[PDB]
Write a protein that binds this ligand. Structure first.
Ligand SMILES: O=C1Cc2ccc(-c3ccco3)cc2C(=O)N1O
Ligand SMILES: [Mn+2]
Ligand SMILES: [Mn+2]
Lengths: 534, 400
């Protein structure tokens, strides 16, 4: 009864014709029983050798639609992500329905049924429903499921129906008896469209399993994820492996899928043996201890505010909690990013505030109030002096050490009575020899030999020397904007050990004034140290 | 649902270009609710139609409120679709010269001319749900949409017939049209400008604001410091200042000033100006007022606007098509969010610079913004009050 979705192949491309693998009397009989069943249920139709196309079938039954998927058009996946149980509000009555044979109950475009052709190892088959494993079956089903559900939701405004794939979440603040009949209507409404809902895939009492979450009356806990410790993986339970683990990635961050997936750079048959490259053995194992950690949260109350508190941890890691009542957290997580060039803690905190803000808008459609381990004056000093535009939403200070600080601050005007160091660096040809030195208005000077360096590194080395051999107050003059701009970025950490100790000198200093002049002009301080590194 | 009674114009994309495929970003609850109430009424009025996942294209959508506006206006970020849409088929240089110019939102008039039935799939947009509770609601346009660069081009025929009864009873009213807006300027009294802009407004209603004053828009020129007691630091800051302007004006000379700093001197030491350097300074001060050589507007090239954060609530900007040959330079101050929000001031300045560029040249610039991508991409939609959207690059290298 459902209107079909028009499916076109990619332009200039024909259907798939991958030869069938011939196999044994053992499971070649099960297929035709399976298939007659499917033909007796209307899911597949018979045609002879008229259409050319072929899709391999292995052996419950399995179909390999990979070659067909590479030729099928792109479908806009409407979903911006999965739902989070913390996004749910508490409803007096909850129900989780699951549709029986979700895919095998939505008709396929009749013009597109020809390329679906396959042959039992003989009678040839072509699908008339959404096939499992095809590219478009998820998008077409959910679209079909939605507009099939819309007249029901409109005529039943007192209930809320959340739909994702097979599982239907049906919540309401109605009486259980009234909530009872409203469900049976939905099942009867679904049954009239050819979508049955079995009775023990029907979830009646609670802990209600919706998308791998146990929905207790006043809490939710993620379903313990357990996936196999077998010995000889094949690339189907390697593709079901990458599948049901990179949905776990949404609730469990840090679960990456690069290794496994890379194992299908080949024309492999879906049933043949697949060797684990030893790179892939730590992939699973790295987070098998992450997967075993529990997750639990509370439900959302829109009458109260959202509070987000962030804490500082080791090695550029940050923890955060999102709650409405104190310590009754809706969501918690970890964030870990140190920059590849130069980062400081205030930047990382600004990034953490922004990353939580976005996922808060994703889940609740609003920005939380933040409690951050930073002084108002520390922040005020940072953003007003930062060369770039920056800002954070409405927040308040929380005294949870280690607090975030500014570890140094360059001065804005040159310092009277402070030693003025002019620095420079240089390199020569293929010589693999560098010079970084300084000259001082008081006559002080120094030059050191360098081994394997860039040209920036010489300029950064020159600045570092002036910080070493100077008092608590110093004015430094460089011709290098690279060096001057790196300190202008105000980093407190670095992967460059030279930069790290320039920081360490900068922290120990009392007043530093960095100054820039164009090289190879008549400037008195620049040219003297420039000749010394000639 | 209902087809348009009047006839459709054929439109195509650029050669060899496909339609836009831009992911929808997360929306606040108030905007989704606003987009839901707006798109339902638009769908009932046959202006948009629900589509499935067979359409592989998508364009972002959100909603804004204009200055002092209390109602939500839908904004569709057509920046990608416009980039891939064909060019169609003059800019009134007198719009800049008028005393008062008002901007009117004529985007609703576009909802009466139908979109090419074969072009409609490229206007697909999806309204996301909170916490992805339900799949987003997909739509495409059946009529000329607001924010598409092809809508005012196709409507130019109809718009001309609506405005010429007004424009020859007022042959000195400059009327420029850019995207969903009409820019209308005059040299009239402020009292007599407002009711003549309201009569043109109600003449539009016969078929079926926000005010500017462009004759006092400033240009901030290059200004050298002129203190009286120059220190070493004050002079070597002017030397790199002048050595910088030598890229714009090749006639700058900095040597006799640099001669004053010869020898390793302390930055705070005051340096007397040997008078052959003040001649170099007075000449440099006056070789900064002439027009830059080779500066003109090429409407076949993109505009570029760079914005610098000066702090204390002031922001400098330069409009140019190729470096050092600036078409316009300026500075803003005391905008909304001053001394409290850098993003809100940058978002305002982007709106102000673009409004100027539309009035002057009839084109919006490509902005280089002094902000990380992630900070700007988190807040800019919260302060946007313009019916157009420009394109931007992010600047992470400190200037001067
Ligand atoms: O002696 C010299 C000559 C020089 C030329 C060009 C550049 C340069 C190009 C782009 C950025 O910087 C830098 C230097 C420099 O640092 N020293 O020291
Ligand atoms: Mn140098
Ligand atoms: Mn040098």
């Amino acid at each position: 009864p459902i209107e079909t979705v028009p499916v076109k192949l990619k332009p200039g491309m024909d259907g798939p014709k991958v030869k069938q693998w011939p196999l044994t009397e053992e499971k070649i009989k099960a297929l035709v029983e399976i298939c007659t069943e499917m033909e007796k249920e209307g899911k597949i139709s018979k045609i002879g050798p008229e259409n050319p196309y072929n899709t391999p079938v292995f052996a419950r039954k399995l179909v390999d639609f990979r070659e067909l998927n590479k030729r099928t058009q792109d479908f806009w996946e409407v979903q911006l992500g999965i739902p989070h149980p913390a996004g749910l509000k508490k409803k007096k009555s909850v129900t989780v329905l699951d549709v029986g044979d979700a895919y095998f109950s939505v008709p396929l475009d009749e013009d597109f049924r020809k390329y679906t052709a396959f042959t039992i190892p003989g009678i040839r088959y072509q699908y008339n429903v959404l096939p499992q494993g095809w590219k478009g079956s998820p998008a077409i089903f959910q679209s079909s499921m939605t507009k099939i559900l819309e007249p029901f939701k409109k005529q039943n405004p007192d209930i809320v129906i959340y739909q994702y794939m097979d599982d239907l979440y049906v919540g309401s603040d109605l009486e259980i008896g009234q909530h009872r009949t409203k469900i049976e209507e939905l099942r009867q409404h679904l049954l009239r469209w050819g979508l049955t809902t079995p009775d023990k895939k029907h979830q009646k009492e609670p802990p209600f399993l919706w998308m791998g979450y146990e929905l207790h009356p006043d809490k939710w806990t993620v379903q313990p994820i357990v996936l196999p410790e077998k010995d000889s993986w094949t690339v189907n339970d390697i593709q079901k492996l990458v599948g049901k683990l990179n949905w776990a990635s949404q609730i469990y961050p840090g679960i990456k899928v690069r290794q496994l997936s890379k194992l299908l750079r080949g024309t492999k048959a879906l049933t043949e043996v697949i060797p684990l490259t030893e790179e892939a053995e730590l992939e699973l194992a790295e987070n098998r201890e992450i997967l075993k950690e529990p997750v639990h949260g509370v439900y959302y109350d829109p009458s109260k505010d959202l509070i987000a508190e962030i804490q500082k941890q080791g090695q550029g890691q940050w923890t955060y909690q999102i709650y409405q009542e104190p310590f009754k957290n809706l969501k918690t997580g970890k964030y870990a990013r140190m920059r590849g060039a130069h980062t400081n803690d205030v930047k990382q905190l600004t990034e953490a505030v922004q990353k939580i803000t976005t996922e808060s808008i994703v889940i609740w459609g609003k920005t939380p109030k933040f409690k951050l381990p930073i002084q108002k004056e520390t922040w005020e000093t940072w953003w007003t002096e930062y060369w770039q535009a920056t800002w954070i939403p409405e927040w308040e200070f929380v005294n949870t050490p280690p607090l975030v600080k500014l570890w140094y601050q360059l001065e804005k005007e040159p310092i009277v009575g402070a030693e003025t160091f002019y620095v420079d660096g240089a390199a020569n040809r293929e010589t693999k020899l560098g010079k970084a030195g300084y000259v001082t208005n008081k006559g002080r000077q120094k030059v050191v030999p360098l081994t394997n360096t860039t040209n920036q590194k010489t300029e950064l080395q020159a600045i570092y020397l002036a910080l070493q051999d100077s008092g608590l107050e110093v004015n430094i003059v460089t011709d290098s904007q690279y060096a001057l701009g790196i300190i202008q970025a105000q980093p407190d950490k670095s992967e460059s050990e030279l930069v790290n100790q320039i920081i360490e000198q900068l922290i120990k200093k009392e007043k530093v004034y960095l100054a820039w002049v164009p090289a190879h002009k008549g400037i008195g301080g620049n040219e003297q140290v420039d000749k010394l590194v000639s | 649902g209902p087809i348009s009674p009047i006839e459709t114009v054929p439109v195509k994309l650029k050669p060899g270009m496909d339609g836009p495929k831009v992911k929808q970003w997360p929306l606040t609850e108030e905007k989704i609710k606003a987009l839901v109430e707006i798109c339902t009424e638009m769908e009932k009025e046959g202006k948009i139609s629900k589509i499935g996942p067979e359409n592989p294209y998508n364009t972002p959508v959100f909603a804004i409120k204009k200055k002092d506006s209390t109602k939500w206006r839908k904004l569709v970020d057509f920046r990608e679709l416009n980039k891939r849409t064909q060019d169609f088929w003059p800019h009134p240089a007198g719009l800049k010269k008028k005393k008062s110019v008002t901007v009117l939102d004529v985007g609703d008039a576009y909802f009466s001319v139908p979109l090419d039935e074969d072009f409609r799939k490229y206007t697909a947009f999806t309204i996301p749900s909170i916490n992805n509770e339900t799949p987003g609601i997909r739509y495409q346009y059946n009529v000329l949409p607001q924010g598409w660069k092809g809508s005012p081009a196709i409507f130019q025929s109809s718009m001309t017939k609506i405005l010429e009864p007004f424009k020859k009873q007022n042959p000195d009213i400059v009327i420029y049209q850019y995207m969903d807006d009409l820019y209308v300027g005059s040299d009239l009294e402020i009292g007599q400008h407002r009711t003549k802009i309201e009569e043109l407004r109600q003449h539009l209603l016969r078929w079926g604001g926000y005010e500017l004053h462009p004759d006092k828009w400033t240009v901030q020129p290059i200004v050298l410091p002129e203190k009286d007691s120059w220190t070493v630091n004050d002079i070597q800051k002017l030397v790199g200042k002048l050595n910088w302007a030598s890229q714009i004006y090749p006639g700058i000379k900095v040597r006799q000033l640099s001669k004053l700093l010869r020898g390793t001197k302390a930055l705070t030491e005051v340096i007397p100006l040997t008078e052959e350097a003040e001649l170099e300074l007075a000449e440099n001060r006056e070789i900064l007022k002439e027009p830059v050589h080779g500066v003109y507007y090429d409407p076949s090239k993109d505009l570029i606007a760079e914005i610098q954060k000066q702090g204390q609530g002031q922001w400098t900007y330069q409009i140019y098509q190729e470096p050092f040959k600036n078409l316009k330079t300026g500075k803003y101050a005391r905008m909304r969010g001053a001394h409290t929000n850098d993003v809100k001031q940058l978002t305002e300045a982007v709106q102000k610079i673009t409004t100027e560029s539309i009035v002057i040249w009839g084109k919006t610039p490509k902005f280089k913004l002094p902000i990380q991508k992630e900070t700007w991409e988190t807040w800019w939609t919260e302060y946007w009050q313009a019916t157009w959207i420009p394109e931007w690059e992010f600047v992470n290298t400190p200037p001067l």
